[PDB]
Amino acid sequence: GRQFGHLTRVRHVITYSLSPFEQRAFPHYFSKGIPNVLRRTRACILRVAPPFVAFYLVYTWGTQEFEKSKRKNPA
């Protein structure tokens, strides 16, 4: 279902567009582009990054104890 023309009620909103054959597909790509990816990364690190490093650490520690355990000095 749903169609077009029966979605919802909208009032007083103009939308200017420009034909794809009259604009560039990659405007300020490196110029405006890269700062944006840096900004998105900033916004998300503190929520994505930590959980992972918690595993990263659990992983290397987990392996060391294992490997180091199958060895022994006296008794």
Binding site: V10, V13, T15, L18, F21, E22
Partner: protein
């Protein structure tokens, strides 16, 4: 006369779209056109012939289904519009060539 008498610069045609969504009004208006040549150009006659074939329609024309123009005919039978008109507007070295129509919210697509 003398200095301070400039000519007319050409006007770039762009080709884009402006939509003014307003569901409060009961019938949609749409106007679509390609760039036409100016007044001078000889090929305005052929454009007008082609436009005449497509013609115009309005909901008070007698003769519906039997109208020659296929757009007119299909518009009247399936009631895909309330009115439509082709145009060939002319300016110095450019122009708007195309059509305009008016219709219920659910007929804009078929009409186009």
């Amino acid at each position: 006369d003398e200095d301070a008498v400039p000519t007319l610069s050409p006007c770039r045609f762009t080709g884009s779209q402006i939509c003014h969504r307003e569901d409060g009004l009961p019938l949609a208006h749409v106007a679509i056109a390609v760039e036409g040549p100016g007044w001078a150009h000889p090929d305005n006659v052929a454009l007008q012939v082609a436009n005449a074939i497509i013609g115009h329609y309005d909901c008070t024309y007698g003769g519906g289904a039997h109208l020659s123009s296929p757009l007119a005919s299909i518009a009247a039978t399936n009631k895909l519009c309330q009115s439509f008109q082709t145009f060939n507007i002319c300016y110095a070295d450019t122009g708007l060539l195309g059509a305009h129509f008016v219709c219920d919210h659910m007929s804009i697509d078929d009409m186009m």
